[PDB]
Write an enzyme that holds these catalytic residues in place. Structure first.
Site: not given
Lengths: 243, 293
Positions: A37, A96-97, A139
């Site tokens: 998302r 994100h990660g 993340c």
């Protein structure tokens, strides 16, 4: 006697805030990242970090939704620049990660090492001897951290010195971002920074508290727990005063 | 970003009923039972507007393709601020479907050439008291589809069933009906997607109104009822709202709106989005609509 990083320079330093919001390009290309998302809320932390590092006399330099390639260039730029009139350099990545990586708008990773090494003493002689701070909200795994019950409460210097690296979370675990208020780490990093800076406390003291807050913050849903974890190769207390 | 969700827990109910041509619609039905390793013959039945002209199995990728198109339609109502992260058989080996004229099923019921025999009276007896009485009525029509998911059904994917049928009288009966129970209350967990049907707030207000939503465990929680009529929309649903406070600085409130359930209708498209997720109601009936005449 003592030691403290110089921060007199009126325009303290740059603040590349890289705020990633739309990962649509990624939802298409990279297959594994199709059930991903968008980071709704990131704006509250970009407008949070901008406010904080404003009273701290930092000339913010925001950047839209960038992809790995663009990100590398964005860094490769503030690297060939001169930072003499600057006594500090900050860089914030939001997106994100996973395991030591930070996805970009595109969908392809970008190892943290190759982003933070871009500003070594060598690569940027202008920044040598001056603190280079990095805040990485992302993340770092798919695992969720459990929560146990405490029941209380003239010369040459090393090439990779003076480096503060704030990690929104330990390795292998997920970071938490809230759509309405913001992300836990970035928000605590400010509500605690924007407050402890008047009373002159070094960043290392501030990050301690921050690990306290996020540790209490709890994912009411999936019994989740977050736990930041900074790393520093600094030489003197890092502290920035304002007005 | 996590790959450990949906598994031996995801099994509410998904139904899609679309008009395939002039007089032929197709019914897609996926329930909890069809998604488990049956070890014995399992029986299940519902209502169809007309008679079945063919029964086939579809790929499970369908279960999510449907649930998506709908869950999204309702999600545009919510304001969830939860933390995020970074005489007409159709035999086959496994199953066995039979489509009889509602009333006929009552008179012969016992006849289990569909092979739901070894369940004997001690097992069939049950269905005539708690189910059967709710599938046949004064309108002796209302054909009843009877399936007998025999073991082996789990093997391979394609657990979803699909009924191709000819609607009689322009009627469409979305099968929400349950198995009459002693308690008196029924819990709904189903999403449906029917198209080529005309709105009907009269019956939707009646349903939605009698829905008891799940709790968020907050004294300040209130369950409001809605009846909006947007541009190309018209929603009848009940949501649960409660204001929340900041977690740091300013005293900024956050007005939630979750657990929305009801019916959403696309005035243009002529489609019906239904969502009754873990809600309770004392109303145990099917929803009857009219095909765009």
């Amino acid at each position: 006697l003592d030691k403290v990083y110089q921060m007199k320079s009126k325009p303290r330093g740059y603040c590349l805030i890289i705020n990633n919001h739309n990962f649509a390009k990624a939802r298409e290309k990279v297959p594994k990242l199709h059930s991903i998302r968008d980071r709704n809320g990131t704006h509250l932390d970009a407008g949070a970090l901008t406010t904080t590092f404003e009273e701290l006399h930092f000339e913010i330099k925001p950047h839209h939704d960038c992809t790995v390639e663009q990100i590398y260039e964005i860094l490769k730029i503030y690297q060939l620049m001169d930072h003499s009139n600057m006594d500090c350099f900050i860089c914030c990545i939001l997106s994100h990660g996973d395991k030591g990586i930070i996805y970009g708008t595109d969908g392809q990773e970008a190892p943290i090492y190759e982003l933070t090494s871009q500003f070594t003493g060598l690569k940027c002689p202008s920044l040598a001897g001056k603190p280079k701070v990095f805040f990485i909200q992302a993340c770092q795994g798919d695992n969720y951290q459990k929560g146990i019950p405490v029941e209380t409460d003239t010369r040459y210097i090393p090439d990779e010195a003076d480096f503060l690296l704030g990690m929104a979370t330990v390795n292998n675990c997920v970071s938490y971002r809230n759509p309405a208020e913001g992300t836990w780490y970035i928000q605590s990093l400010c509500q605690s920074l924007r407050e402890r800076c008047p009373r002159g406390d070094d960043i290392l003291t501030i990050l301690t508290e921050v690990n306290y807050e996020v540790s209490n913050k709890d994912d009411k849903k999936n019994m989740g727990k977050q736990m930041p974890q900074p790393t520093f190769t600094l030489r003197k207390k890092l502290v920035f005063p304002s007005d | 970003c996590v790959i450990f969700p949906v598994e031996i827990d995801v099994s509410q109910t998904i139904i899609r009923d679309c008009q395939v041509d002039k007089q032929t619609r197709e019914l897609v039905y996926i329930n909890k039972i069809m998604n488990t390793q049956l070890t014995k013959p399992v029986l299940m039945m519902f209502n169809i507007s007309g008679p079945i002209r063919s029964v086939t199995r579809k790929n499970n990728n369908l279960r999510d393709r449907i649930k998506s198109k709908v869950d999204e339609q309702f999600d545009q109502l919510e304001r969830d601020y939860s933390d995020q992260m970074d005489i007409k058989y159709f035999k086959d080996e496994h199953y066995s479907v039979s489509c009889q004229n509602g009333s006929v099923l009552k008179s012969k019921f016992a006849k289990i050439l569909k092979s739901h025999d070894y369940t004997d009276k001690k097992s069939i007896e049950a269905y005539e008291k708690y189910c059967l009485p709710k599938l046949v009525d004064e309108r002796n029509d209302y054909y009843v589809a009877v399936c007998v998911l025999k073991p082996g059904f789990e093997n391979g994917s394609n657990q979803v069933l699909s009924f191709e049928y000819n609607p009689i009288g322009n009627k469409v009966i979305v099968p929400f009906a349950h198995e009459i129970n002693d308690t008196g209350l029924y819990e709904y967990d189903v999403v449906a997607y029917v198209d080529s049907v005309q709105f009907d707030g009269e019956q939707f207000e009646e349903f939605v109104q009698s829905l008891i939503l799940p709790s968020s465990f907050k004294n300040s929680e209130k369950v409001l009822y809605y009846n909006e009529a947007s541009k190309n929309k018209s929603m009848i649903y009940k949501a649960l709202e409660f204001t929340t406070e900041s977690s740091w600085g300013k005293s900024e409130k956050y007005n939630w709106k979750i657990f929305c359930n009801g019916f959403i209708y696309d005035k243009k498209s002529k489609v019906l989005y239904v969502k009754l997720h873990n809600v309770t109601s004392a109303l145990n009936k099917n929803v009857i609509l009219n095909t765009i005449k």
